[PDB]
Amino acid sequence: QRPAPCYDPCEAVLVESIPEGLDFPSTGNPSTSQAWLGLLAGAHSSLDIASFYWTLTNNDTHTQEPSAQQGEEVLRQLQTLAPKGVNVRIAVSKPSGPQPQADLQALLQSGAQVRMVDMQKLTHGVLHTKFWVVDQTHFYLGSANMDWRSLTQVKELGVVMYNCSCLARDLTKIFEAYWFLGQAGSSIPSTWPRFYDTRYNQETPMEICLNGTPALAYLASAPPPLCPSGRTPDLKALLNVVDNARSFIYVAVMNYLPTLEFSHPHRFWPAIDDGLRRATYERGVKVRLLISCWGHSEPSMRAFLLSLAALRDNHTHSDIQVKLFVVPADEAQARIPYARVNHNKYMVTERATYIGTSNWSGNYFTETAGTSLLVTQNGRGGLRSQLEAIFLRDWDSPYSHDLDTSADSVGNACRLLAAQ
Amino acid sequence: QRPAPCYDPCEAVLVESIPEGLDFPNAGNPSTSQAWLGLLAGAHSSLDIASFYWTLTNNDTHTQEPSAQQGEEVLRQLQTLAPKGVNVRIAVSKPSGPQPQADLQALLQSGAQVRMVDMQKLTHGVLHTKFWVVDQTHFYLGSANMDWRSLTQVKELGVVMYNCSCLARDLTKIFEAYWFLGQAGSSIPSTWPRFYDTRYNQETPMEICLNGTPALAYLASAPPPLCPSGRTPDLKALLNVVDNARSFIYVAVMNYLPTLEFSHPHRFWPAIDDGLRRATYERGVKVRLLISCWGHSEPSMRAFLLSLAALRDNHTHSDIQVKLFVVPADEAQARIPYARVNHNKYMVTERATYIGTSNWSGNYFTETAGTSLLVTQNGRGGLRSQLEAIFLRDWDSPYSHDLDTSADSVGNACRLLAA
Ligand SMILES: *[C@@H]1O[C@H](CO)[C@@H](O[C@@H]2O[C@H](CO)[C@@H](O[C@H]3O[C@H](CO[C@H]4O[C@H](CO[C@H]5O[C@H](CO)[C@@H](O)[C@H](O)[C@@H]5O)[C@@H](O)[C@H](O)[C@@H]4O)[C@@H](O)[C@H](O[C@H]4O[C@H](CO)[C@@H](O)[C@H](O)[C@@H]4O)[C@@H]3O)[C@H](O)[C@H]2NC(C)=O)[C@H](O)[C@H]1NC(C)=O
Ligand SMILES: *[C@@H]1O[C@H](CO)[C@@H](O[C@@H]2O[C@H](CO)[C@@H](O[C@H]3O[C@H](CO[C@H]4O[C@H](CO[C@H]5O[C@H](CO)[C@@H](O)[C@H](O)[C@@H]5O)[C@@H](O)[C@H](O)[C@@H]4O)[C@@H](O)[C@H](O[C@H]4O[C@H](CO)[C@@H](O)[C@H](O)[C@@H]4O)[C@@H]3O)[C@H](O)[C@H]2NC(C)=O)[C@H](O)[C@H]1NC(C)=O
Ligand SMILES: *[C@@H]1O[C@H](CO)[C@@H](O[C@@H]2O[C@H](CO)[C@@H](O)[C@H](O)[C@H]2NC(C)=O)[C@H](O)[C@H]1NC(C)=O
Ligand SMILES: *[C@@H]1O[C@H](CO)[C@@H](O[C@@H]2O[C@H](CO)[C@@H](O)[C@H](O)[C@H]2NC(C)=O)[C@H](O)[C@H]1NC(C)=O
Ligand SMILES: [Mg+2]
Ligand SMILES: [Mg+2]
Ligand SMILES: [Mn+2]
Ligand SMILES: [Mn+2]
Structure with a gap:
């Protein structure tokens, strides 16, 4: 019934990027930059990267920012790997249109392998995933793109799992589907071959020793056409966590919208929304949604967040709260x-x-x-x-704002706040 | 495979009860009282009544109100039908606990048949339906209970369909399920016998001639265990109307709550709520929800109504609006x-x-x-x-209030306002 457990000494480290000038007067995590540099310096046999886009240099962004140095150093170290015998495979989303690829060209010339995945053609999606698998042993999974801005000018949250080969190998199965689909002539197979399958999923998670105590871990993926036998869909895994909570649900996510954003006519999509309403009303769960806001925020988000915030009621014990996290900007950063x-x-x-x-x-x-x-x-x-302490640090910080906050007071453009 | 059309000269009349003191300047339907008295006077062979409870007299409600006299006259006329040869069959919800049944005792004594339906035992529900079927030809369907207060002290909306035997016989099939289950020893049959089935439903409605022009009509019923083959469930029919709307949805309902109420564990129930959200967001449908409010209103409705009201956004063309309809009450009326x-x-x-x-x-x-x-x-x-004209009369009247209205300022107790 249950699959084999893992005997590796798995260790997890939360890693963040904290933008220049963002101050939290309190503990510290290793930075995304530091963690990535360490992974690169120790890579000896293989590096697989799932990626959305590559802008690791000032030239890529047509800027002359001092704070691009960290991304430029990442690209410099990446270029050393293939010449020293590391097998580098990079899957990247096919861009919407013509675009130079200076980073990937440089990596190809160093000996790395690069394939573009045309998710638009295959599923009408894009390859949005960000992760690294290093020597089939460690991995990075999180929000940071292959982007110098992802190190110093955008706030990021990820995890590095060290010394955890069973799970690294499991993640490589997800990478291999991108790798297959990046080849000329590829199409979604009606049945993925068995070597893509996994035994480790919502119903039977992987038993691992995580920082010296037992834990259950698994990896979910999207979209459904890329799901082989045994692989839990991302949506199912997410809703299972929401449905199982009995005390609180804390969510920090850049964009939240209960819609199928880009499909015509536009379509209402309440899967997560109703999950959160069910949690707070049926089980008294305290829901805190920390949504980001900037100049590029879809303004239709505001009414849907106000609609959730309205479900606060002392007598039913319904308790959903929404705040907007806004990264301030000075004139140069703007x-x-x-x-x-x-x-x-x-x-x-x-x-x-x-x-x-x-x-x-x-x-x-x-x-x-x-x-x-x-x-x-x-x-x-x-x-x-x-991870809860990081959430509460951000939630309680001066950068988080209630939905009735004056837009002219938060230190950066924010479309989801009123002028009132 | 379409079923037979109806050839009867069907005629529909909206009938309301307007409580004493409720004024609408210059807005003219026969009252529930008048329509019921007309049906009773013309009844020659049969009367079936589905009912929730009976309080047609002052003594029933322990009051001394002159405005109870219309209900008392309805009861007096009901008592004349069985002696004159009319087959009277009354189905009534079994009360939660012991309660006197003065009205139904008087109707039994006059020769009417009365059966009490234990919906609590059968389905964990109650027999909430209100309709009359008169002579297998006319019917009343609507909100009014067999209650003197339903004529003069509560606002009601219903319809009387006259001269429409095909549809009246169709409604009797729903009544017959109540009538069967009100017999001692009854149970829900695993399959309802064929004589309960109907051909007229959401997929193939009845073609009728309604006030001289073609129309499509059908009757939906709840709960699912009482649905025989062919009968559209109430929820499916309701959601179909919501899902087919392309311009506006106007809803006037006493209580709206996206829950399975008084269930413990509490249960969220978004079937209608998500249909309205889908309508306004996907199709740009303008939704107006007119919910009633009084001192007995469940206060948890407020958060769910505010949650719908928040979905008004110029640029998505989402446009849901909520108001509360409050009937004023002075100290005597209260x-x-x-x-x-x-x-x-x-x-x-x-x-x-x-x-x-x-x-x-x-x-x-x-x-x-x-x-x-x-x-x-x-x-x-x-x-x-x-019916749209009635909705807008109510919506535009001084009795309808935005959710930010002071609870001091609506003429009656209202639990859904913050004050
Ligand atoms: C499961 O197991 C894993 C593996 O063991 C655990 O991960 C370990 O967690 C440790 C936390 O206890 C963590 O310790 C470090 O965390 C922080 C990262 O330090 C890094 O950055 C420092 C600052 O860098 C800035 O400044 C330098 C010069 O000043 C500049 O060059 C640079 O550009 C930056 O601007 C460096 O100085 C460090 O050398 C390191 O590179 C640090 O904050 C920690 O140091 C201090 O932390 C406390 C409180 O923050 C201070 O009060 C105290 O004085 C310390 O000196 C510390 O170095 C481990 O790094 C991390 N391991 C790995 C491999 O990442 C998981 O926690 C565990 N999970 C559990 C137990 O649940
Ligand atoms: C499909 O066909 C059906 C069948 O015909 C149509 O239904 C008919 O609709 C008619 C609307 O034009 C309607 O006509 C009358 O409607 C009103 C109701 O009249 C009744 O009540 C009056 C109220 O008097 C009482 O008022 C107080 C209230 O506090 C009471 O306490 C007290 O008892 C008073 O007596 C009575 O006076 C009437 O005798 C009647 O019982 C009336 O207001 C209408 O009268 C006005 O209009 C006429 C001419 O239009 C004027 O001459 C008059 O002076 C008034 O200004 C009107 O008589 C029919 O009653 C109704 N039929 C049935 C059987 O119900 C549907 O409308 C049709 N639908 C469609 C879409 O076409
Ligand atoms: C991952 O495993 C390696 C071992 O392969 C760990 O490295 C050892 O760390 C201990 C404690 O710091 C030292 O005593 C050994 O000398 C190290 N050996 C080698 C070969 O490096 C490493 O610390 C583990 N990483 C994490 C994050 O736990
Ligand atoms: C229901 O059916 C009866 C029977 O035809 C209709 O009553 C007739 O109406 C006409 C037209 O006004 C009168 O001239 C006749 O005298 C009526 N006959 C009888 C026997 O009453 C009636 O109008 C129909 N519609 C309604 C709403 O009752
Ligand atoms: Mg999925
Ligand atoms: Mg139903
Ligand atoms: Mn869980
Ligand atoms: Mn329709």
Whole structure:
């Protein structure tokens, strides 16, 4: 019945990017930059990267920002891997139109292998997933793109799992589907071959030793056409955490919208929304939704968030709260394209950890590629409590604002607030 | 494979009860009282009544109100039918606990047949339906209970369909299920016998001649265990109207709650709520929900109504609006038990009419008995526009209030306002 357990000494580390000038007067996590540099320096045999886009340099973004140095160093170290014998495979989303690929050209010339995946053709989605698998042993999974802005100008949340080969090998099965689909002539197979299958899923998670105590872990993926036998869909894994919570659900995600954003005519998509309403009304669960806001936020988000916030009622014990996280910007930072936003995508409850790559609207679960890590672990003081502390740090910070906040007071453009 | 059309000269009349003191300047339907007295006077062979409870007299309600006299006259006329040869059959919900039944005892003594239906035992619900079928030819369907207060002290909305035997016989099939289950030793049959089945439903409605022009009509019923082959469930019919609307949905219902109420564990029930959200967001449908409010209103409705009201956004063209209809009550009116509230339960769109007996929460569609009339009819005017005109009269009146209105300022106690 149950699959084999894992004997590897798995260790998980939450890693963040904190934008320049964002201050939290309190503990510290290793930075995305530091963690990535360490992974690269120790890579000896293989590196697989699932990626959305590559802008690791100032030239890529047509900027002259000092704070692009960290991404430029990442690209410099990446270029050293293939010449020293590491097998580098990079899957990247096919861009919407003509676009130079200076980073990937440089990596190809160093000996890395690169394939573009045309998710638009295959599923009408895009390859939005961000992860690394290093020597079939460690992996990074999280919000940070292959982007210098993802290190110093955008807030990111991810995890690095070290020394955990069983789960690294499991994640590689998700990578291999991108790798297969990046080849000329590819199409979605009606049945994925058995070597894509996994035994480790919602019904039977992987038993691992995580920081020296037992834990249950599995990896979910999207979209459904890429799901082989045994692989839990991302949406199912997410809703299972929501449905199982009995005390609180804390969600930090850049975008939340109960719609199929890009499909015509536009379509209502209440899967997650009704899950949250069911949790608070049926089980008294305290729901806190921390949504990001910047100049590029879809303004239709505001009415849907107000609709959830209205479900606060002392007598039913319904208790959903919404705040908007806004990264401030000064004049120089405002000139950097697509920067100064909180990019995290995660959920934590009193009993479970969910760390994802996708924003929370319907296309990310039906058409677009993504991956999430799901962990449960008995006891206190582990990965789950560390992620809860990050959430509460952000939730309580001066960068989080109620929906009635004056837009002219938050330090960056925010479309989801009124002038009132 | 379409079923036979009806050849009867069907004629529909909307009938209301307007509580004493409720004024609408310059807005003219026969009252429930008048319509019921007309049906009783003309009845020559049969009267079937589905009913929730009977309090047609002052003594029933322990009051001394002159406005009870219309209900008392209805009871006096009901007592004349069986002695004159009319077969009277009355189905009534079994009360929660012991209660006197003065009205039904008087009707039994006159020769009427009365059966009490234990819906609590059968389905964990109650027999909430209100309708009359007269001479297998006419019927009343609507919100009014067999209650003197339903004539003069509560606002009611119903319809009388005259001269329409095909549809009246169709409604009797729903009555016959109540009538069977009100017999000692009854149980829900695993399959209902064929004589309960109907051919007229959402997929193939009855073709009738309604006020001289073609129309499509059918009758939906609740709960599912009482549905024989062919009978559309109330919830399916309701959601079909919501899902087919392309311009507006106007709903006037006493209670709206997206829950399976008084269930513990509490159960969320978004069937209708999500249909309205889908309509406004996907199709740009303008939704107006007119919910009643009084001192007995369940206070948890407020958060769910505010949650719908938040979905108004210029650029998505989402446009849901909520108001509360409050019937004023002075200190004398407030001494009357369970009065001074708007009882209507109906929905109208730019293309369809829905008139029901149930409030809009989950138990009414899963466990409790109810019935609704569904009509579509090509053309301007008609029943549909008459019901729309009633809705807008109420919506625009000084008795309808936005959810940010002070609770001091609506003329009666209202639990859904913050003050
Ligand atoms: C499961 O197991 C794993 C593996 O063991 C555990 O992960 C470990 O967690 C440790 C936390 O106890 C963590 O410890 C470090 O965390 C922080 C990261 O330090 C890094 O950055 C520092 C600062 O870098 C800035 O400054 C330098 C110079 O000042 C600049 O060059 C640079 O550009 C930056 O601007 C460096 O100084 C470090 O050398 C390191 O590179 C640090 O904050 C920690 O140090 C201090 O932390 C406390 C409180 O924050 C201070 O009060 C105290 O003085 C410490 O000096 C510390 O170095 C481990 O790094 C991490 N391991 C790995 C491999 O990442 C999981 O926690 C565990 N989970 C459980 C138990 O649930
Ligand atoms: C499909 O066909 C059906 C069948 O014909 C149509 O139904 C008919 O609709 C008619 C509407 O034009 C309607 O006509 C009358 O409607 C009103 C109701 O009249 C009744 O009540 C009056 C009220 O008087 C009482 O008022 C107080 C209230 O506090 C009482 O306490 C007290 O007892 C008073 O007596 C009575 O006076 C009437 O005798 C009657 O019982 C009336 O207001 C209408 O009268 C006005 O209009 C006429 C001419 O239009 C004027 O001459 C008059 O002076 C008034 O201004 C009117 O008589 C029919 O009653 C109704 N038929 C049935 C059987 O119900 C549907 O409308 C049709 N649908 C469509 C879409 O076409
Ligand atoms: C992953 O496993 C390696 C072993 O392969 C760990 O490295 C050892 O760490 C201990 C404690 O710091 C040292 O005593 C050993 O000398 C190290 N050996 C080697 C070969 O490096 C490493 O610390 C583990 N990583 C994490 C994050 O737990
Ligand atoms: C229901 O059917 C009866 C029977 O035809 C209709 O009553 C007739 O109406 C005409 C037209 O006004 C009168 O001239 C006749 O005298 C009536 N006959 C009888 C026996 O009453 C009646 O109008 C129909 N519609 C309604 C709403 O009752
Ligand atoms: Mg999915
Ligand atoms: Mg039903
Ligand atoms: Mn769980
Ligand atoms: Mn319709």
